[PDB]
Amino acid sequence: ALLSFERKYRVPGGTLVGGNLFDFWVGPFYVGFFGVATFFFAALGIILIAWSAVLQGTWNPQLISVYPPALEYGLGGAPLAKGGLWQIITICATGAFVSWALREVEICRKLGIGYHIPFAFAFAILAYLTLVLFRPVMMGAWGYAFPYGIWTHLDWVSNTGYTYGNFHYNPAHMIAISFFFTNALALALHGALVLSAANPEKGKEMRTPDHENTFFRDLVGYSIGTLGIHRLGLLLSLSAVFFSALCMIITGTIWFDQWVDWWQWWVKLPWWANIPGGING
Amino acid sequence: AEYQNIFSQVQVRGPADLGMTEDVNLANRSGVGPFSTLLGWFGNAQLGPIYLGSLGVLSLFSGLMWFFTIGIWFWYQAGWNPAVFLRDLFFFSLEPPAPEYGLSFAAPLKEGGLWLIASFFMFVAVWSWWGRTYLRAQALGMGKHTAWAFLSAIWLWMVLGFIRPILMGSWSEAVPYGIFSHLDWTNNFSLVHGNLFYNPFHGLSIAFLYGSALLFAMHGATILAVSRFGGECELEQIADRGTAAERAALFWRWTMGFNATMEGIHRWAIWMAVLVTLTGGIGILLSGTVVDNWYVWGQNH
Amino acid sequence: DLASLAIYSFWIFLAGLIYYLQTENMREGYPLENEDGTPAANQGPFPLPKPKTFILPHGRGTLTVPGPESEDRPIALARTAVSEGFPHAPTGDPMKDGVGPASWVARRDLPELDGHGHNKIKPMKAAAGFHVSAGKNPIGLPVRGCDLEIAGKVVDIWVDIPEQMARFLEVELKDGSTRLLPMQMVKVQSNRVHVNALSSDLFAGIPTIKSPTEVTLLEEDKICGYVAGGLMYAAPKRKSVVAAML
Ligand code: BCL
Ligand code: BCL
Ligand code: BCL
Ligand SMILES: CC[C@H]1c2cc3[nH]c4c(c3C)C(=O)[C@H](C(=O)OC)c4c3nc(cc4[nH]c(cc(n2)[C@@H]1C)c(C(C)=O)c4C)[C@@H](C)[C@@H]3CCC(=O)OC/C=C(\C)CCC[C@@H](C)CCC[C@@H](C)CCCC(C)C
Ligand SMILES: COC(C)(C)C/C=C/C(C)=C/C=C/C(C)=C/C=C/C(C)=C\C=C\C=C(C)\C=C\C=C(/C)CC/C=C(\C)CCC=C(C)C
Ligand SMILES: CCCCCCCCCCCC[N+](C)(C)[O-]
Ligand SMILES: [Fe+2]
């Protein structure tokens, strides 16, 4: 089944691998070489997860958890039921995430659009990879990575954060948070404007981009503009994730203590670190 | 290499745009501000004009009053020493009255009074601004979508410093005005309520907070990927679908099996964002009024 | 327990929200069809929404969605397999037939007006007060195609007034006529504007505009669809990254 305006788009081409071998769709989904590579990685990864569930002894989605190799194993392999599965599953996730992006690119080529989407996605893959691959490696142990489990990974965040006191003090973390909040704010604002313009008060003609600009200027004295707002939304969310990866990649590699202490560099600045009074005086 | 439309290649500038008039009282609209070639690389280069009626004046006034009330306290906490003011800027905090004072306004200025005063200004500033987001839309005959979405944010804000503190019986529950202190408060709030990760509404709020970053990255990337067809002209693409809207829709359909419409995607967007503080506001409001420990609560659910 | 009653109610709400949301995003492209253009058996769990009517600005009309598919022109593609799910090959030249990456929609053949009723897009020549305020001014530069051949020169910038944004580049061809090139499909360089999407020999075929001072939505689409189509259909004519660095 196609959208009423789709047929003209389902033409051959755009694939990056295997010419027209996998160039086709299954229902609404496009397959392509990476379509199968994804299904392969996804299934094998899901299979190994269900397997770990078996070895763990439970089918409860709430309880199933796959931990990485204990710190003891450092950066080598480990018994499938004690670090190895997580290791193969991680590869299966990476392969599946990368294959998902590469699949997107082919789709981009077939439709003739820009590659922004898979490019943006890559940041997510890079964030995940930062937690699961890069930080662990720099720290010398897959043990430092998080566990695949609905709650265990939340426990992982809690315990990892509290390892440095209140993680709120990680400056990279703050910037990241600002980006996430600013983003949601931008998203609400953006979605609201387009809608307020497309859906004026009952009975009126659709508002125009001029009304959009006018509304925001009247309100805030500025309008970033349609192109800008999307550029912003993309920049905001991609920056959030980028600073998330950053806030983590440095935690445990170049900064080990309580983050709150980091801020002492500013308080201790030679020209006021000793003035009595205030909070730190 | 190809150009990914992240920054404009060439900037163009026409005369200052005074915008639409509709039912707007032009007498309350300032003149155009300056043009930023800086901003211009990313979005419009034009600053202003801004509309400032009475509500707007009341809002900026209260807002500044709130800000300054915190500022004077900060300066007081600094001993009026600019050097100390700057080094401990993030450490200063205007805290609310202790539990002893309950929901009374008897707290001595230096011990909850200023905070109460600052909060009153902030209260007025925010609500008057909300009315403004409504009235500015009304003057242009637009939907109140912004006003409504703003409420969702206001909801979390009101719950944190007004609604919940009242329900709890004291201003001491409210959030302090300080960079770090308000962070300490957040952490503390989790600690005192049995870890907020076990709060279902905190988990949701995060799903939507991640989802907003996920969706805007998607939407923004999409639009930019079809801007070569004028996809940014969304209102236009809504009224008269173009290959831009079709290719955007098909990319997602072929990728994840379903898609949106030029107008519908913004509905997904507004809810994704609005749900953030909506669920979150509920999460917080329930904390300490109905649930003292989310871990505990979680055990029976 | 309130918390419980709350989280319970929320999921109902969320499911309904998603439902509502999903149905709203079916105001276009639905009902689904089989590759042969007939109603597809499966239409999905969500039913088409109640129609809504958009009162268009400046009596340009109304848009009622969902409604009957506006696309009825001929699609120059032929099935490549009896079973559903396969590509449909171009029967002629996809670039010219307007299919594949070069598809275009039969949008309204009028230029878009701004809030004040003036063509939203104008050539700078005709945009009072508009000028290049930053960045290399593209005007006057020679336009090079992926074949690394000159296909013309930039004679003007078409500006989106409301957004004070450059939308197209007006490129004069060898024959003296001009074509609009999407701004986001050209790379303004120091000594020339490069168009990777098209080769010199394809510029002539870029759909032309009726009036030299305005462009309509239908024309825009036709111009954009065509220029994008080049990425795929001009591949043989396009030069390598190494050839371009010479
Ligand atoms: C007590 C706990 C600590 C704390 C400890 C930590 C730790 C520890 C970490 C964070 C991290 C983050 N913290 Mg913190 N944090 C605290 C309090 C806060 C507060 C707040 C209100 O107080 C806020 C707003 C934040 C905000 C954040 C975010 C910036 C960041 C997580 C987003 C991210 O990186 O995504 C990145 C994106 C991804 C991980 C997604 C990858 C998705 C993959 C590519 C695709 C999945 C496909 C899927 C499997 C298929 C599904 C099937 C389909 C649905 C069909 N923290 C407290 C103080 N925080 C994290 C960070 O920076 O991470 C880098 C982090 O590690
Ligand atoms: C750096 C940030 C931390 C982190 C911090 C948190 C915190 C803090 C919270 C979550 C929560 C969630 N996390 Mg997490 N999370 C991390 C990395 C991941 C990864 C991954 C491959 O990297 C995945 C798939 C998830 C997935 C999830 C969801 C199950 C859950 C809420 C959905 C959401 O926020 O969607 C954002 C995305 C969308 C809305 C799009 C659709 C995504 C769907 C909903 C996710 C399906 C996940 C799926 C069940 C995993 C199984 C896949 C199968 C094996 C194939 N997290 C890293 C380690 N996560 C929330 C929760 O309730 O946890 C219990 C929560 O509070
Ligand atoms: C140790 C700390 C606890 C914790 C304690 C809390 C608490 C406590 C809260 C959150 C809340 C949130 N947490 Mg938490 N949180 C933790 C860990 C996390 C992690 C993680 C580890 O990854 C993540 C991703 C999150 C994520 C989140 C967000 C979903 C949510 C905040 C939305 C928001 O910022 O609205 C920000 C928006 C507002 C506050 C709206 C109000 C803004 C007003 C209207 C405007 C004021 C303007 C003002 C006058 C200044 C003007 C500025 C000038 C114009 C420039 N938390 C840890 C476990 N978290 C909040 C929530 O709702 O939870 C359910 C909350 O209250
Ligand atoms: C980079 C910035 C933001 C962003 C962008 C982004 N995400 C994206 C994209 C983009 C641009 C896509 O194009 C792509 C998409 O197609 O969405 C519809 C996607 C996507 N983002 C997703 C999720 C997601 N994104 C997130 C975040 C973000 N995405 C950022 C905020 C989050 C979180 C935690 O915040 C999540 C959960 C997917 C829905 C989708 C990518 C789908 C995909 O890759 O499918 C291939 C694989 C499978 C179907 C199965 C893999 C199964 C196993 C191999 C592994 C699983 C094991 C383990 C790793 C999971 C552990 C889970 C526990 C922690 C609960
Ligand atoms: C004057 O000094 C110079 C330098 C100019 C300026 C210096 C100013 C400075 C340094 C200002 C710093 C301000 C800061 C750091 C503010 C930080 C705020 C933060 C970090 C968080 C805010 C959280 C606040 C919330 C959640 C507030 C909620 C408030 C309400 C819900 C309203 C409550 C109202 C009450 C109790 C009053 C009751 C009144 C009635 C009857 C309605
Ligand atoms: C606690 C406040 C909750 C506010 C929820 C508002 C969501 C905004 C929804 C936008 C759609 C508006 N509407 C009525 C015009 O359709
Ligand atoms: Fe948009």
Tab-separated table of N, CA and C in Angstrom, chain A residues 5-6 8-9 25 28-30 100 103 107 111-114 116-117 162 168-169 180 183-184 187 190 192 195-196 199-201 207 211-212 214-215 217-219 221-228 230-231 233 237 266 272 275 277-281, chain B residues 4-6 8 19-20 22 29 41-44 46 48-51 77 83 86-88 129 132 137 140-145 180 183-184 187 191 212-213 219 221 223 225 228 232 234-235 243 246-247 250-252 254-257 263 266-267 273:
chain	number	residue	atom	x	y	z
A	5	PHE	N	0.086	9.687	-3.258
A	5	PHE	CA	1.046	10.447	-4.061
A	5	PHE	C	2.437	9.828	-4.082
A	6	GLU	N	2.523	8.569	-3.677
A	6	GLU	CA	3.798	7.875	-3.581
A	6	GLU	C	4.368	7.203	-4.830
A	8	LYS	N	4.868	7.657	-7.902
A	8	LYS	CA	5.864	8.362	-8.696
A	8	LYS	C	7.245	8.422	-8.055
A	9	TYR	N	7.323	8.115	-6.766
A	9	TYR	CA	8.605	8.165	-6.071
A	9	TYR	C	9.290	6.808	-5.968
A	25	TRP	N	10.574	-2.567	-1.618
A	25	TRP	CA	9.861	-2.300	-0.381
A	25	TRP	C	9.092	-3.512	0.100
A	28	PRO	N	5.142	-0.498	3.644
A	28	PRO	CA	5.574	0.894	3.552
A	28	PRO	C	7.079	1.035	3.700
A	29	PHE	N	7.719	0.004	4.241
A	29	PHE	CA	9.157	0.052	4.470
A	29	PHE	C	10.013	-0.210	3.252
A	30	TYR	N	11.110	0.533	3.148
A	30	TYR	CA	12.052	0.331	2.069
A	30	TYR	C	13.019	-0.669	2.656
A	100	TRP	N	20.885	1.388	10.253
A	100	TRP	CA	19.648	2.161	10.188
A	100	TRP	C	19.896	3.513	9.529
A	103	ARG	N	20.698	2.990	5.918
A	103	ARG	CA	19.451	2.701	5.229
A	103	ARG	C	18.761	4.013	4.936
A	107	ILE	N	17.639	5.830	1.355
A	107	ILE	CA	16.323	6.421	1.203
A	107	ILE	C	16.446	7.877	0.753
A	111	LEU	N	14.960	9.489	-2.770
A	111	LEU	CA	14.015	10.615	-2.763
A	111	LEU	C	14.662	11.937	-3.183
A	112	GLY	N	15.982	11.940	-3.289
A	112	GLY	CA	16.688	13.139	-3.696
A	112	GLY	C	16.762	14.267	-2.678
A	113	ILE	N	16.573	13.955	-1.394
A	113	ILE	CA	16.623	14.972	-0.342
A	113	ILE	C	17.994	15.018	0.333
A	114	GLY	N	18.178	15.963	1.256
A	114	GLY	CA	19.446	16.095	1.960
A	114	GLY	C	19.664	14.968	2.954
A	116	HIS	N	20.538	15.290	6.144
A	116	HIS	CA	20.463	15.798	7.499
A	116	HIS	C	19.962	14.795	8.533
A	117	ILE	N	18.872	14.108	8.227
A	117	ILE	CA	18.310	13.150	9.159
A	117	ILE	C	19.325	12.101	9.638
A	162	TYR	N	25.863	9.789	41.185
A	162	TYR	CA	26.219	9.994	42.572
A	162	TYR	C	27.655	9.670	42.901
A	168	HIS	N	24.678	17.312	38.909
A	168	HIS	CA	24.194	18.626	38.472
A	168	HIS	C	25.338	19.596	38.290
A	169	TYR	N	26.424	19.355	39.007
A	169	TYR	CA	27.582	20.241	38.954
A	169	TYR	C	28.525	20.015	37.800
A	180	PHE	N	18.622	20.719	26.324
A	180	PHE	CA	17.394	19.931	26.326
A	180	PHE	C	16.173	20.758	26.674
A	183	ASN	N	15.534	23.248	23.965
A	183	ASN	CA	14.958	22.518	22.839
A	183	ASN	C	13.455	22.288	23.002
A	184	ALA	N	13.053	21.669	24.105
A	184	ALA	CA	11.635	21.415	24.345
A	184	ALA	C	10.856	22.706	24.234
A	187	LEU	N	10.715	23.620	20.642
A	187	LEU	CA	9.781	22.714	19.998
A	187	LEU	C	8.334	23.101	20.265
A	190	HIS	N	7.749	26.369	18.428
A	190	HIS	CA	7.615	26.132	16.995
A	190	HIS	C	6.307	25.449	16.639
A	192	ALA	N	3.640	25.365	18.176
A	192	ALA	CA	2.526	26.261	18.503
A	192	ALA	C	2.315	27.369	17.489
A	195	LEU	N	0.935	25.990	14.120
A	195	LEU	CA	-0.465	25.679	14.334
A	195	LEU	C	-1.338	26.912	14.529
A	196	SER	N	-0.834	27.913	15.252
A	196	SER	CA	-1.612	29.122	15.510
A	196	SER	C	-1.839	29.870	14.221
A	199	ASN	N	-4.161	27.420	12.040
A	199	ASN	CA	-5.478	27.333	12.644
A	199	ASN	C	-5.835	28.620	13.365
A	200	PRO	N	-6.046	29.706	12.606
A	200	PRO	CA	-6.396	30.980	13.236
A	200	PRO	C	-7.725	30.827	13.957
A	201	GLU	N	-8.208	31.898	14.564
A	201	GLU	CA	-9.490	31.817	15.242
A	201	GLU	C	-10.510	31.343	14.213
A	207	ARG	N	-3.367	32.162	8.708
A	207	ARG	CA	-2.429	33.232	8.918
A	207	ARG	C	-1.263	32.930	8.003
A	211	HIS	N	2.438	36.777	9.763
A	211	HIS	CA	1.743	36.795	11.045
A	211	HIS	C	2.621	36.107	12.078
A	212	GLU	N	3.348	35.090	11.629
A	212	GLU	CA	4.215	34.359	12.525
A	212	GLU	C	5.290	35.293	13.026
A	214	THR	N	5.307	38.547	12.930
A	214	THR	CA	4.702	39.632	13.669
A	214	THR	C	4.334	39.225	15.085
A	215	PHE	N	3.801	38.021	15.237
A	215	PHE	CA	3.436	37.542	16.561
A	215	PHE	C	4.655	37.473	17.473
A	217	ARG	N	7.557	38.947	17.191
A	217	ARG	CA	8.225	40.214	17.390
A	217	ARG	C	7.443	41.011	18.416
A	218	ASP	N	6.128	41.037	18.246
A	218	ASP	CA	5.268	41.756	19.169
A	218	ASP	C	5.506	41.227	20.574
A	219	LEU	N	5.665	39.906	20.663
A	219	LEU	CA	5.843	39.198	21.921
A	219	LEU	C	7.200	39.258	22.561
A	221	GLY	N	10.098	40.647	20.527
A	221	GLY	CA	10.960	41.574	19.821
A	221	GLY	C	11.877	40.898	18.823
A	222	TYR	N	11.572	39.646	18.474
A	222	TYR	CA	12.376	38.905	17.509
A	222	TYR	C	11.661	37.685	16.906
A	223	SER	N	12.059	37.318	15.694
A	223	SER	CA	11.508	36.150	15.025
A	223	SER	C	12.673	35.559	14.287
A	224	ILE	N	13.017	34.323	14.616
A	224	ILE	CA	14.150	33.666	13.987
A	224	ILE	C	13.859	33.292	12.519
A	225	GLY	N	12.583	33.152	12.172
A	225	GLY	CA	12.246	32.801	10.807
A	225	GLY	C	12.122	31.306	10.610
A	226	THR	N	11.280	30.904	9.663
A	226	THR	CA	11.028	29.493	9.388
A	226	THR	C	12.284	28.664	9.167
A	227	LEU	N	13.201	29.150	8.356
A	227	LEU	CA	14.397	28.367	8.146
A	227	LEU	C	15.126	28.276	9.474
A	228	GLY	N	15.350	29.432	10.089
A	228	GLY	CA	16.053	29.480	11.359
A	228	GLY	C	15.493	28.607	12.454
A	230	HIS	N	14.002	25.805	12.348
A	230	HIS	CA	14.300	24.399	12.122
A	230	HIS	C	15.801	24.232	12.306
A	231	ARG	N	16.564	25.204	11.838
A	231	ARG	CA	18.000	25.123	12.015
A	231	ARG	C	18.233	25.084	13.534
A	233	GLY	N	16.067	24.213	16.122
A	233	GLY	CA	15.609	22.956	16.682
A	233	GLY	C	16.650	21.867	16.484
A	237	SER	N	18.840	20.369	19.849
A	237	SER	CA	18.828	18.949	20.200
A	237	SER	C	20.145	18.208	19.890
A	266	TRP	N	36.978	28.568	40.133
A	266	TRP	CA	36.471	29.927	40.003
A	266	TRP	C	36.495	30.682	41.336
A	272	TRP	N	40.255	37.099	44.662
A	272	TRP	CA	39.099	37.201	45.550
A	272	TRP	C	38.890	35.967	46.411
A	275	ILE	N	38.874	37.130	49.996
A	275	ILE	CA	38.065	38.207	50.542
A	275	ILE	C	37.010	37.606	51.462
A	277	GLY	N	33.620	37.117	53.687
A	277	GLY	CA	32.243	37.454	53.379
A	277	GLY	C	31.635	36.537	52.341
A	278	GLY	N	30.420	36.852	51.918
A	278	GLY	CA	29.763	36.034	50.921
A	278	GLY	C	29.507	34.616	51.392
A	279	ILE	N	29.440	33.690	50.446
A	279	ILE	CA	29.185	32.300	50.774
A	279	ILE	C	30.481	31.539	51.022
A	280	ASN	N	31.477	31.790	50.183
A	280	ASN	CA	32.753	31.105	50.301
A	280	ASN	C	33.782	31.889	51.105
A	281	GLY	N	33.311	32.919	51.804
A	281	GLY	CA	34.194	33.742	52.613
A	281	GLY	C	34.024	33.536	54.110
B	4	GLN	N	24.985	21.983	3.232
B	4	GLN	CA	23.949	21.357	4.053
B	4	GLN	C	22.932	22.331	4.689
B	5	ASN	N	22.842	23.535	4.134
B	5	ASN	CA	21.888	24.552	4.585
B	5	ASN	C	21.835	24.832	6.091
B	6	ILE	N	22.969	24.729	6.778
B	6	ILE	CA	22.979	24.994	8.210
B	6	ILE	C	23.124	26.482	8.477
B	8	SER	N	23.171	30.275	6.305
B	8	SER	CA	22.876	30.875	5.002
B	8	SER	C	24.196	31.145	4.295
B	19	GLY	N	5.713	44.403	10.095
B	19	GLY	CA	4.739	43.336	10.243
B	19	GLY	C	3.274	43.629	10.014
B	20	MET	N	2.436	42.661	10.371
B	20	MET	CA	0.999	42.770	10.198
B	20	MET	C	0.388	43.631	11.274
B	22	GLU	N	-3.453	43.872	11.578
B	22	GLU	CA	-4.609	43.172	12.091
B	22	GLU	C	-5.293	44.085	13.121
B	29	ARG	N	3.381	49.507	19.725
B	29	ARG	CA	4.438	48.769	19.060
B	29	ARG	C	5.610	49.719	18.876
B	41	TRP	N	23.015	34.900	9.986
B	41	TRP	CA	23.618	33.719	9.408
B	41	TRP	C	22.796	32.492	9.725
B	42	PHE	N	22.060	32.570	10.825
B	42	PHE	CA	21.252	31.461	11.308
B	42	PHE	C	19.772	31.663	11.050
B	43	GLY	N	19.284	32.865	11.345
B	43	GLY	CA	17.881	33.169	11.134
B	43	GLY	C	17.759	34.609	10.692
B	44	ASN	N	16.610	35.218	10.947
B	44	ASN	CA	16.423	36.605	10.589
B	44	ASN	C	17.452	37.484	11.263
B	46	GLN	N	16.835	40.716	11.579
B	46	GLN	CA	16.044	41.769	12.194
B	46	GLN	C	15.590	41.646	13.633
B	48	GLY	N	13.378	43.469	16.713
B	48	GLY	CA	12.274	44.402	16.822
B	48	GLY	C	11.422	44.365	15.570
B	49	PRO	N	10.271	45.036	15.566
B	49	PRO	CA	9.783	45.808	16.708
B	49	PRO	C	9.170	44.913	17.753
B	50	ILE	N	9.014	45.450	18.955
B	50	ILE	CA	8.417	44.712	20.046
B	50	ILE	C	7.184	45.480	20.480
B	51	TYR	N	6.161	44.767	20.918
B	51	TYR	CA	4.927	45.394	21.371
B	51	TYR	C	4.944	45.435	22.893
B	77	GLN	N	24.145	39.559	50.612
B	77	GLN	CA	24.910	38.368	50.975
B	77	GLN	C	26.392	38.523	50.630
B	83	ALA	N	33.618	42.084	44.229
B	83	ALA	CA	34.489	40.933	44.044
B	83	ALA	C	33.827	39.671	44.573
B	86	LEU	N	30.769	38.577	42.509
B	86	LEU	CA	31.127	37.807	41.329
B	86	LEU	C	31.658	36.407	41.594
B	87	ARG	N	32.485	36.230	42.615
B	87	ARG	CA	32.998	34.891	42.871
B	87	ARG	C	31.966	33.918	43.464
B	88	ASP	N	31.019	34.422	44.250
B	88	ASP	CA	30.026	33.548	44.858
B	88	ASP	C	28.657	33.700	44.206
B	129	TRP	N	2.588	37.806	31.599
B	129	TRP	CA	3.217	37.473	30.335
B	129	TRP	C	2.357	36.454	29.606
B	132	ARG	N	-0.355	38.051	27.927
B	132	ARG	CA	0.247	38.689	26.776
B	132	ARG	C	0.390	37.687	25.609
B	137	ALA	N	-1.671	37.007	20.305
B	137	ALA	CA	-2.178	36.056	19.326
B	137	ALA	C	-3.553	36.517	18.870
B	140	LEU	N	-3.729	39.254	16.355
B	140	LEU	CA	-3.386	38.862	14.998
B	140	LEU	C	-4.367	37.818	14.493
B	141	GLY	N	-5.370	37.518	15.319
B	141	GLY	CA	-6.404	36.557	14.959
B	141	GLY	C	-5.901	35.134	14.876
B	142	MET	N	-4.794	34.870	15.559
B	142	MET	CA	-4.196	33.550	15.549
B	142	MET	C	-4.733	32.645	16.623
B	143	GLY	N	-4.361	31.380	16.527
B	143	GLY	CA	-4.795	30.428	17.521
B	143	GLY	C	-4.056	30.757	18.798
B	144	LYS	N	-4.560	30.249	19.911
B	144	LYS	CA	-3.953	30.515	21.192
B	144	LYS	C	-2.974	29.413	21.545
B	145	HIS	N	-2.605	28.617	20.547
B	145	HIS	CA	-1.660	27.522	20.741
B	145	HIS	C	-0.474	27.865	21.618
B	180	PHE	N	23.156	27.378	41.991
B	180	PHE	CA	23.413	26.072	42.582
B	180	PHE	C	22.344	25.604	43.564
B	183	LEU	N	19.684	23.791	42.281
B	183	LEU	CA	20.105	22.465	41.841
B	183	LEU	C	20.097	21.590	43.104
B	184	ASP	N	20.693	22.096	44.188
B	184	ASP	CA	20.730	21.358	45.444
B	184	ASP	C	19.315	20.939	45.811
B	187	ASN	N	18.104	17.946	43.622
B	187	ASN	CA	18.728	16.724	44.126
B	187	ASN	C	18.062	16.350	45.440
B	191	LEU	N	16.134	12.889	46.685
B	191	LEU	CA	16.562	12.178	47.877
B	191	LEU	C	15.434	11.992	48.884
B	212	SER	N	11.467	15.191	22.665
B	212	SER	CA	11.464	16.521	22.065
B	212	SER	C	12.790	16.701	21.360
B	213	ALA	N	13.871	16.282	22.000
B	213	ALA	CA	15.163	16.408	21.367
B	213	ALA	C	15.196	15.455	20.167
B	219	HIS	N	12.441	16.497	12.899
B	219	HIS	CA	11.755	17.532	12.142
B	219	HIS	C	12.714	18.530	11.524
B	221	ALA	N	15.823	18.300	10.849
B	221	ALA	CA	16.667	17.670	9.832
B	221	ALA	C	15.851	17.442	8.570
B	223	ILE	N	12.947	19.031	7.484
B	223	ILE	CA	12.708	20.306	6.838
B	223	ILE	C	13.937	20.784	6.093
B	225	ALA	N	16.289	19.016	4.946
B	225	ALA	CA	16.567	18.051	3.888
B	225	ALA	C	15.662	18.278	2.683
B	228	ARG	N	15.283	22.315	-0.134
B	228	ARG	CA	15.654	22.450	-1.542
B	228	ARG	C	14.380	22.412	-2.376
B	232	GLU	N	10.660	24.589	4.168
B	232	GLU	CA	10.540	25.474	5.338
B	232	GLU	C	9.260	26.274	5.254
B	234	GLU	N	6.400	25.798	5.482
B	234	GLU	CA	5.411	24.890	6.028
B	234	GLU	C	3.953	25.324	5.874
B	235	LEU	N	3.607	26.536	6.287
B	235	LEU	CA	2.227	26.984	6.141
B	235	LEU	C	1.789	26.842	4.687
B	243	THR	N	6.191	18.683	-3.455
B	243	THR	CA	7.069	17.521	-3.406
B	243	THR	C	7.916	17.538	-2.137
B	246	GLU	N	5.865	15.835	0.414
B	246	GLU	CA	5.705	14.437	0.021
B	246	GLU	C	6.994	13.680	0.270
B	247	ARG	N	8.120	14.254	-0.132
B	247	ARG	CA	9.391	13.579	0.085
B	247	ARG	C	9.723	13.453	1.568
B	250	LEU	N	7.473	10.700	2.783
B	250	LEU	CA	7.909	9.383	2.320
B	250	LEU	C	9.227	8.910	2.929
B	251	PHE	N	10.121	9.844	3.238
B	251	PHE	CA	11.368	9.438	3.853
B	251	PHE	C	11.003	8.686	5.126
B	252	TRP	N	10.207	9.319	5.975
B	252	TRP	CA	9.815	8.703	7.227
B	252	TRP	C	8.957	7.471	7.068
B	254	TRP	N	9.019	5.372	4.478
B	254	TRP	CA	9.927	4.316	4.059
B	254	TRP	C	10.931	3.935	5.138
B	255	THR	N	11.159	4.820	6.100
B	255	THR	CA	12.129	4.502	7.135
B	255	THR	C	11.538	3.790	8.322
B	256	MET	N	10.489	4.361	8.899
B	256	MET	CA	9.874	3.754	10.066
B	256	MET	C	8.439	3.257	9.850
B	257	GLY	N	7.987	3.187	8.604
B	257	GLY	CA	6.651	2.659	8.364
B	257	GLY	C	5.438	3.569	8.463
B	263	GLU	N	1.170	19.855	8.440
B	263	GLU	CA	0.526	20.427	9.622
B	263	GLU	C	0.592	19.484	10.841
B	266	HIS	N	3.543	19.303	13.416
B	266	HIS	CA	3.663	20.344	14.413
B	266	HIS	C	2.765	20.053	15.583
B	267	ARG	N	1.775	19.189	15.372
B	267	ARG	CA	0.879	18.792	16.456
B	267	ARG	C	1.659	17.769	17.295
B	273	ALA	N	6.535	18.358	23.342
B	273	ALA	CA	7.069	19.371	24.261
B	273	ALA	C	6.152	19.651	25.458
